[PDB]
UniProtKB/Swiss-Prot annotation, chain A:
Keyword set includes Ribonucleoprotein: yes
Principal location: mitochondrion
Residue ranges crossing the lipid bilayer per the database entry: none
Leader sequence residues: none
Lineage, broadest ranks: Eukaryota, Metazoa, Chordata, Craniata, Vertebrata
GO CC terms of this entry: mitochondrial inner membrane; mitochondrial matrix; mitochondrial small ribosomal subunit; mitochondrion
Subcellular location: Mitochondrion
Protein family: Belongs to the universal ribosomal protein uS10 family.
Keywords for this protein: Mitochondrion, Ribonucleoprotein, Ribosomal protein
Subunit structure and binding partners: Component of the mitochondrial small ribosomal subunit (mt-SSU). Mature mammalian 55S mitochondrial ribosomes consist of a small (28S) and a large (39S) subunit. The 28S small subunit contains a 12S ribosomal RNA (12S mt-rRNA) and 30 different proteins. The 39S large subunit contains a 16S rRNA (16S mt-rRNA), a copy of mitochondrial valine transfer RNA (mt-tRNA(Val)), which plays an integral structural role, and 52 different proteins.
GO biological process, one term: mitochondrial translation
Name of the protein in question: Small ribosomal subunit protein uS10m
Residues of the full protein shown: 102 to 151 of 201
UniProtKB/Swiss-Prot annotation, chain D:
Any Gene Ontology CC annotation: mitochondrial inner membrane
Organism: Homo sapiens (Human)
Protein name according to UniProt: Small ribosomal subunit protein uS14m
GO biological process, one term: mitochondrial translation
Organism superkingdom: Eukaryota
Disorder named in the UniProt entry: Combined oxidative phosphorylation deficiency 38: An autosomal recessive disorder due to mitochondrial dysfunction and characterized by perinatal hypertrophic cardiomyopathy, growth retardation, muscle hypotonia, elevated lactate, dysmorphy and intellectual disability.
Assembly: Component of the mitochondrial small ribosomal subunit (mt-SSU). Mature mammalian 55S mitochondrial ribosomes consist of a small (28S) and a large (39S) subunit. The 28S small subunit contains a 12S ribosomal RNA (12S mt-rRNA) and 30 different proteins. The 39S large subunit contains a 16S rRNA (16S mt-rRNA), a copy of mitochondrial valine transfer RNA (mt-tRNA(Val)), which plays an integral structural role, and 52 different proteins. Interacts with LIAT1.
Protein keywords: Disease variant, Mitochondrion, Primary mitochondrial disease, Ribonucleoprotein, Ribosomal protein
Swiss-Prot record, chain E:
Family, per entry: Belongs to the universal ribosomal protein uS5 family.
Name by which UniProt lists this protein: Small ribosomal subunit protein uS5m
Compartments it resides in: Mitochondrion
Domain of life: Eukaryota
Domain annotation S5 DRBM: ranges: 131-171
Quaternary context: Component of the mitochondrial small ribosomal subunit (mt-SSU). Mature mammalian 55S mitochondrial ribosomes consist of a small (28S) and a large (39S) subunit. The 28S small subunit contains a 12S ribosomal RNA (12S mt-rRNA) and 30 different proteins. The 39S large subunit contains a 16S rRNA (16S mt-rRNA), a copy of mitochondrial valine transfer RNA (mt-tRNA(Val)), which plays an integral structural role, and 52 different proteins.
UniProtKB/Swiss-Prot annotation, chain I:
Quaternary structure (record): Component of the mitochondrial small ribosomal subunit (mt-SSU). Mature mammalian 55S mitochondrial ribosomes consist of a small (28S) and a large (39S) subunit. The 28S small subunit contains a 12S ribosomal RNA (12S mt-rRNA) and 30 different proteins. The 39S large subunit contains a 16S rRNA (16S mt-rRNA), a copy of mitochondrial valine transfer RNA (mt-tRNA(Val)), which plays an integral structural role, and 52 different proteins.
Ranges of Basic residues composition bias in the record: 31-41
Regions of compositional bias (Basic and acidic residues) in chain numbering: 42-49
Name recorded for this polypeptide: Small ribosomal subunit protein mS33
Length: 50, 131, 81, 101, 171, 132, 327, 56, 49
RNA sequence: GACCUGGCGGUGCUUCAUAUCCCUCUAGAGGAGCCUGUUCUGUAAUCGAUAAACCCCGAUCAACCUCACCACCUCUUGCUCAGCCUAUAUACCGCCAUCUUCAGCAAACCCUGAUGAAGGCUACAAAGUAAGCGCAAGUACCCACGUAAAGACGUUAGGUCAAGGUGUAGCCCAUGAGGUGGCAAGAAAUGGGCUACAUUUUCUACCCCAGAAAACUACGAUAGCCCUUAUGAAACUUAAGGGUCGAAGGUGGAUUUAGC
């Protein structure tokens, strides 16, 4: 389409949290979950509204 | 894009087991799908309470339940117009007669709308989903 | 029409075939955005575009003629709202 | 049809708290300042104290929407740790995996 | 609550209690063992308690060359369908209650003298249809293992013979 | 011992699918997610409502197609659209499938107020990954 | 008769891929290979295996960490396991005189090597590694034991030690693989020149969470600037200044170079350690090759991998456990 | 309604289904605007910010 | 809204369009308890008085 | 009477344990104050865990609510095509502890013991072949290292009917539902932790070249008392800050924990 585009990758973000592994007691034992968020930044330039 | 010659019409499920394999299956498969849609619509209108939680933004009017019963219970000319808009041939006539017996004035326009509804349908209830 | 296979193979096994393969069903494929389709799509979309003013070649020229800059953001998420 | 009577009591509390939120906010503003006369602020103290008890927002409890567990609930998903793990361990929560590092 | 309902597999697995601590070291008796019953066996898709007739699911799609409309079975007609369903269940249940007459061996509860049928055919199209097998002894031998303690094994003595001079036995 | 979502070894006669054969520590290594939406991304909202919808849809489809589903659902959300991809069996007649597709697509579109599509893939029998 | 519940079709049902099945899989790959080229708009005749992988990666994007779980489109010969052909004909006579051993391929090889040794007796390295076991099994398409592998390699060594002919040496080379030995030689930085024509070499360093960039000038007076600040001011602690001196002192070049470095992150000691690495790597351009090797053998060119260890749940620290109570 | 029936045909491809939904208002209109369909009674900015008129 | 979910799926079951494996399980159990005599008593006219 | 298998032996020999058994190395606990569990005792007044494998444990959490407890009062087809935190974790699913800081569990065959319970290896080889599962390999994090994760079959009828579901039994004018108010204390004992006993210290500036303090006005409470503020409808009670106050404590008995 003739658009000027530059691509760069921002650093990823990992959010981690811990939960109890058993239904009852056993506090020493945990299960840890994470959600990874990856990014890609597309930078267009000199565009018109249309 | 152009028509894909190898594929059956898009309406059908693109699966070897479900793809229609004859001119009769083609018709029956669509009719079965339409029947399913009709059954769902019947349930949606039969139990509006279950489908009244609007979570769509922007609001989608077409995905809301339809209310076909007259909500104005007063015996008046303005209340009769509702039944004519709802196409209740029997309710409109019964109400129109009751209105005329009470002696309240019915506008010519309202009576004309009643004739339009009655003349078009021949004094027969329009087909409904189910009673 | 591709003999694509997916799945961690068992010992002395091969990745599962494509029929009934739920791993391939879980992928967000790009079969509708092949290089041929993209080029054909953009050819039909050129009629909707307008030409950037040639005078505004550099950012310094943009600042001279248009001193104010307004930033706004739109968020595309999945869901009913 | 809620999980239990405890969930049902919280459902009513959340409903009553919503109905009285504006009235409670308006009266509290009269109390949370040193501008208005203390005589007027004392009448406001009684007015907000006379509102129904279940209209007090502090009485609401974030229970698990699936099992009604009052503790171990994750606020982002509104699920108890046991229910969240059941869904996460089966691969049914988008983007949530086991953390190892 | 609709969100607390489990599937049939989870419900039967818990109710049957086939895997537990009471079935490891002869800790539970065999009399109160309950049997799984598939509750989806006689159920038809589209059949409900109200008796609606859905064209294309419960009933045929087209009747007399015309698409059928939504209909509902009359009260008395639904009672017949409900009564028949109860009868069908009772018959199926009756079949399971019936006990097949088992030809007893030397005693009612003894394994000795019971025919096991002909030996299984070989992998290369070999057949032993002439040979007959009969159990001679069934014993519950035991060994001791470090992890589980008593480990129950079965020792079985059988004899095979075609009745024309050829006969053998094995353990 | 860990129990979560682990089909336990038997005598070598229990057929398991590819999803059932992988324990939770493979959810981003050997198997993917059965649902794809943005709620659980950083800075995104409404993760709670997306989860309740997923739990309901999986139960609705299990009871609406009794005995037909050959594996777990794949729930896809793109913008306003909701896409349900189900691997079903080839036992129920096609007429009954088409009825249930039109019925479930319509009933769910009015319930969650969004365009819903149901994409059925038929298999002759359950795809066995291994015998445990 | 008491009917023993009969076994169903074998559940294990080990999948065997007959030669006809493989032939049909190859035809499928060749036909699918042409569609993939048509999809991507490339020439069907020059579409290689590396373009197939690039196309599948785009069309079926999979982020699974394990690459063996990702979608693949490879030639059936590389996918399916190599299966040995039928070893006996219709009459039932096996084709190999050592068939009844169960290891006809292995024992036939042992027989051949033993024969060569007999004839040799009657007639009379660093890059190459002896073929490993898992790789020898593939050649023979036989399952070998660890001791069987040993026996075979011992026989080859006996062959190699004794004088061998042109033919014997070629046979031995069939079971030797190539080892590419990595060189532990430091890579010198490219000497650059500034606007004034002064030689300098930029490099990088890393220590814990600190990262330094050092510019070492070929000629100087011994001035070091850290983040635009003189080094004694930026590093008041003597230990930090000692580390900055270690690279230059070891090569005996104190007072002959001017350094300008920028370090961010970490603490004072981690920053001093990062700058030490950056300066040492940059200074390698101006020292001799032999001096660079001494710098490497002294520990001045190695990135220290010792980073903080994470804390695990159920414990007080990385290794510290909670107080244990026997009772 | 009869004039609509004569031109009525089944959906031919995926694009046509998207078009029908867009016309019916089921599918979102792109490019995505987060305020599509929501107007605060056409209120001006001065109405929200300057509220002293009401304190007279 | 647990009322909407529970009531909707109960109506769909009575209509024949939803198979509730759970509700079927507790209908068979409740049916076998009547044949066994463990039937729910009449309210008010209970064992106690 | 004689055996098979396992366990056990204050059973022999040989080789080993790498934060590990001993000798060694470093900082702690056991003494003091305080915080917080538990046991006892107390209260009209929850429940569960409670050798290793309980004891800042279910709780990433109790002023009302939460709540399941107690007293009094009220309701009876009841938020639900009811309900029950009623009994039974010794009926179970679900999710886990533990050996595991292990490497074994093995279907299907074959052979040995005279066709007994059982057993099956020797590489210059003598009956074992073995799918599968675990280990391993791969993958995550900063590497091929390390740490995570993983860790089968079984053992302790180990933990959990009080996450939820649920078999059996029991309640149905009550063992169900709602309202108001209220208890959650310390004779005493004890686990874990926090802060100290100080000079490698205390205070201030600084963030490492300083000036003072340094034993009855020193070091030392995050306790007590008073006041204020924060959240809340509700604070003598929860939290923060200030003032006031300046206690035991002077390095800790038997014994005991962690770290490559
Ligand atoms: K101490
Ligand atoms: K202590
Ligand atoms: K129970
Ligand atoms: K109370
Ligand atoms: Mg609260
Ligand atoms: Mg008898
Ligand atoms: Mg564990
Ligand atoms: Mg530490
Ligand atoms: Mg102490
Ligand atoms: Mg207690
Ligand atoms: Mg107890
Ligand atoms: Mg507490
Ligand atoms: Mg309370
Ligand atoms: Mg109760
Ligand atoms: Mg137990
Ligand atoms: Mg490693
Ligand atoms: Mg671990
Ligand atoms: Mg491993
Ligand atoms: Mg017990
Ligand atoms: Mg107990
Ligand atoms: Mg009661
Ligand atoms: Mg101090
Ligand atoms: Mg104080
Ligand atoms: Mg206040
Ligand atoms: Mg003092």
């Amino acid at each position: 389409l003739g658009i000027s585009i530059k691509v760069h990758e921002p650093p990823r973000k990992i959010e981690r949290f811990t939960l109890l592994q058993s239904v009852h007691i056993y506090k020493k034992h945990r299960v840890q979950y994470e959600m990874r968020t990856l990014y890609r930044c597309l930078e267009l330039e000199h565009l018109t509204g249309s | 894009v152009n028509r894909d010659t190898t594929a059956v019409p898009y309406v059908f499920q693109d699966d070897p087991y479900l793809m229609p394999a004859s001119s009769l299956e083609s018709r029956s498969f669509l009719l079965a799908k339409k029947s399913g849609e009709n059954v769902a619509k019947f349930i949606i209108n039969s139990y509006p309470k279950y489908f009244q939680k609007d979570i769509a933004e922007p609001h989608i009017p077409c995905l809301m339940p339809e209310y076909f019963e007259p909500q104005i219970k007063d015996i008046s000319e303005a209340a009769l117009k509702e039944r004519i808009e709802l196409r209740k041939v029997k309710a409109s006539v019964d109400m129109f007669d009751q209105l005329l017996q009470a002696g309240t004035t019915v506008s010519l326009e309202t009576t004309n709308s009643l004739l339009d509804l009655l003349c078009y349908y021949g004094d027969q209830e329009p087909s409904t989903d189910y009673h | 029409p591709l003999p694509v296979r997916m799945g961690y193979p068992v010992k002395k096994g091969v990745p599962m075939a494509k029929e009934g393969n739920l791993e391939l069903l879980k992928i967000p494929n790009f079969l509708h955005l092949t290089p041929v389709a993209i080029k054909k799509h953009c050819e039909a979309l050129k009629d909707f575009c307008t030409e950037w003013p040639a005078a505004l070649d550099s950012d310094e020229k943009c600042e001279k003629h248009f001193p104010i800059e307004i930033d706004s953001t739109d968020y595309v998420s999945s869901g009913p709202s | 049809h809620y999980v239990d009577w405890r969930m049902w009591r919280d459902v009513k509390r959340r409903k009553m708290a919503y109905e009285y939120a504006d009235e409670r906010l308006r009266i509290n503003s009269l109390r949370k300042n040193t501008i208005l006369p203390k005589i007027l602020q004392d009448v406001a103290d009684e007015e907000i104290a006379a509102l129904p008890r279940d209209s007090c927002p502090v009485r609401i409890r974030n229970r698990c929407v699936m099992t009604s567990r009052p503790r171990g609930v994750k606020r982002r998903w509104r699920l108890s740790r046991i229910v969240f793990r059941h869904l996460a361990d089966h691969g049914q929560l988008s983007g949530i995996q086991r953390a190892t590092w | 609550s609709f969100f607390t309902k489990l599937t049939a597999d989870e419900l039967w697995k818990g109710a049957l209690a086939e895997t537990g601590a009471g079935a490891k070291k002869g800790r539970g008796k065999r009399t109160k063992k309950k049997k799984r019953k598939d509750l989806n066996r006689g159920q038809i898709i589209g059949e409900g308690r109200y008796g609606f007739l859905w064209p294309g699911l419960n009933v045929p799609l087209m009747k007399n060359g015309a698409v059928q409309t939504i209909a509902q079975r009359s009260k008395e007609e639904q009672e017949k369908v409900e009564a028949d369903m109860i009868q069908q269940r009772e018959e199926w249940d009756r079949k399971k209650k019936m006990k097949v007459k088992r030809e007893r061996g030397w005693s009612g509860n003894s394994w000795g003298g019971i025919s096991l049928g002909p030996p299984d055919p070989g992998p290369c199209g070999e057949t032993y249809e002439d040979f007959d097998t009969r159990i001679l002894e069934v014993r519950n031998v035991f060994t001791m293992t470090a992890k589980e303690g008593r480990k129950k094994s079965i020792r079985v003595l059988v004899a095979v013979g075609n009745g024309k001079g050829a006969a053998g036995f094995s353990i | 011992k860990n129990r979560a979502a682990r089909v336990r070894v038997s005598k070598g006669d229990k057929p398991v699918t590819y999803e059932e054969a992988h324990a939770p520590h493979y959810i981003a290594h050997r198997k993917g997610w059965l649902s794809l939406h943005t709620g659980n991304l950083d800075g995104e909202d409404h993760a709670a409502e997306r989860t309740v919808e997923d739990v309901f849809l999986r139960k609705f489809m299990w009871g609406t197609f009794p005995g037909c589903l050959a594996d777990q659902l794949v729930l896809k959300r793109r913008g306003n659209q909701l896409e349900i991809c189900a691997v079903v069996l080839r036992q129920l007649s096609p007429h009954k499938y088409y009825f249930l597709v039109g019925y479930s697509e319509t009933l769910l579109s009015y319930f969650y107020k969004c365009p819903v599509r149901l994409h059925l893939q038929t298999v002759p029998s359950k795809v066995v990954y291994k015998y445990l | 008769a008491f009917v023993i519940p009969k076994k169903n079709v074998p559940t294990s049902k080990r999948e065997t891929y007959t030669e006809d099945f493989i032939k049909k899989q190859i035809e499928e790959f060749n036909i699918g290979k042409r569609h993939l080229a048509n999809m991507m708009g490339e020439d069907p005749e020059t579409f290689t295996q590396e373009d197939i992988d690039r196309a599948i990666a785009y069309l079926f994007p999979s982020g699974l960490f394990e690459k063996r779980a990702r979608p693949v489109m490879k030639h059936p010969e590389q996918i399916f396991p190599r299966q040995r052909a039928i070893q006996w004909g219709e009459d039932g006579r096996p084709f190999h005189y050592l068939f009844y051993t169960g290891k006809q391929s292995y024992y036939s090889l042992m027989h051949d090597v033993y024969g060569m040794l007999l004839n040799l007796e009657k007639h009379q390295v660093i890059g190459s590694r002896w073929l490993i076991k898992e790789e020898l099994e593939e050649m023979l398409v036989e399952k070998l034991s660890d001791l069987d592998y040993m026996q075979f390699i011992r026989l080859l060594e006996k062959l190699l030690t004794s004088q061998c002919g042109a033919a014997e040496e070629e046979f031995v080379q069939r079971f030797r693989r190539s080892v590419t030995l990595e060189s532990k030689k430091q890579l010198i930085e490219p000497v650059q020149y500034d606007e004034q024509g002064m030689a300098f070499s930029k490099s990088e360093g890393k220590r814990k969470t600190a990262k330094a960039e050092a510019i070492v000038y070929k000629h100087g007076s011994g001035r070091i600037k850290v983040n635009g600040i003189d080094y004694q001011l930026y590093f008041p602690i003597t230990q930090d200044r000692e580390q900055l001196m270690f690279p230059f002192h070891f090569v005996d070049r104190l007072g002959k170079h001017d350094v300008t470095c920028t370090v961010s992150g970490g603490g004072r000691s981690a920053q001093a350690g990062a700058i030490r690495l950056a300066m040492a790597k940059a200074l390698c351009s101006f020292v001799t090759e032999d001096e660079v090797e001494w710098m490497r053998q002294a520990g001045l060119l190695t990135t220290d991998p010792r980073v903080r260890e994470r804390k695990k749940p159920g414990q007080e620290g990385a290794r510290r456990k909670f107080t244990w109570k026997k009772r | 309604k009869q004039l609509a029936t004569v031109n009525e045909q089944p959906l031919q491809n995926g694009f046509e289904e998207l078009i029908q939904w867009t016309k019916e208002g089921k599918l979102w209109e792109f490019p995505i605007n987060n305020e599509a369909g929501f107007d605060d009674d056409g209120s001006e900015f001065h109405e929200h910010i300057f509220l002293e008129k009401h304190l007279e | 809204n647990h009322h909407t979910y529970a009531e909707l799926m109960q109506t769909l079951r009575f209509l024949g369009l939803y198979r509730d494996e759970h509700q079927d399980f507790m209908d068979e159990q409740k049916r076998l308890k009547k044949l066994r005599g463990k039937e729910k008593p009449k309210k008010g006219e209970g064992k106690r008085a």
